[PDB]
Ligand binder design. Sequence first.
Ligand SMILES: NCC(=O)N[C@H]1[C@@H](O)[C@H](n2cnc3c(N)ncnc32)O[C@@H]1CO
Ligand SMILES: NCC(=O)N[C@H]1[C@@H](O)[C@H](n2cnc3c(N)ncnc32)O[C@@H]1CO
Lengths: 151, 152
Amino acid sequence: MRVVIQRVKGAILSVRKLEIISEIKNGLICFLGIHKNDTWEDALYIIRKCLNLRLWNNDNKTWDKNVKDLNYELLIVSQFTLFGNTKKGNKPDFHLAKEPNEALIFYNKIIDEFKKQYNDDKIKIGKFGNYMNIDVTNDGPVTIYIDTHDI
Amino acid sequence: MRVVIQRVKGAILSVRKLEIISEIKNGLICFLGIHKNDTWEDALYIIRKCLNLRLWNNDNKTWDKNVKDLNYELLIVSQFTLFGNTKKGNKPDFHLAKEPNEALIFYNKIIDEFKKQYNDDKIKIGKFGNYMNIDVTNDGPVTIYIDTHDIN
Ligand SMILES: NCC(=O)N[C@H]1[C@@H](O)[C@H](n2cnc3c(N)ncnc32)O[C@@H]1CO
Ligand SMILES: NCC(=O)N[C@H]1[C@@H](O)[C@H](n2cnc3c(N)ncnc32)O[C@@H]1CO
């Protein structure tokens, strides 16, 4: 499983009816990619990293507060393009991405778990399998990458 | 070298005078991280992929046009946080980043090479070593990740 985590001041997510369906204020936007062989343990790792990663400062020191400490939000967005393999040519190859129908069911379980480990109000999502327009205010910017297959 | 590429309809980047210092319309925002071990060839790989990756559709086929074909822009944003190591705990560790002063010089060369391979009016940047506020309209979204240390 792969994620790209960006720290934001706000993010506005729109799709065709454009029409807003999701917004957060301060927090994290997480672009989430599900590998065909991802397991539930891969998901858990991403969930707790997303929720406990210390991407904000204290007055005292840097990198010392996470999203929960600040009561901030998370906008989780499905991104199959993280498995866009560009090693062979300039046409990205998406072979490694779990196929959409299963990846949907897996995605919804992950969202369910994000909520259980934090709060229903705090987890926003996109619209899986649709075109999305996302207005983000990148705060830094801060951008973090995790691939669970590295452990 | 590490890069996160995102396809955008627009991006306004501002810093403390916060005033606007860079703006693009349709194109790519590239979050660019320099490893302490990167050589000029790491850079060349990244530049090539950024400029040539086919992240837009043609009328009759997907993943078939690059930023150049469409005459679109790129906003290049320096990002040491891409080496945020989180294997050990929940405090990210950034030791793999190239040291800032040398990194700026490297970064500046990369930007110039970007200007070379495309058009200096279509290449735009942020403010290395400074807090930046970037208003991005993500178009898709479409996010690509490349670590040169996985390749060659
Ligand atoms: N361009 C925006 C977009 O990525 N759209 C993707 C995802 O929202 C979703 N999707 C399908 N498979 C996956 C997967 N393995 N992981 C994450 N999302 C998936 O289905 C869309 C087209 O495949
Ligand atoms: N928060 C946004 C940010 O990351 N700002 C970084 C980069 O703009 C730049 N910088 C320093 N070292 C590097 C490096 N090794 N690679 C890329 N950029 C660097 O210096 C800022 C603080 O170190």
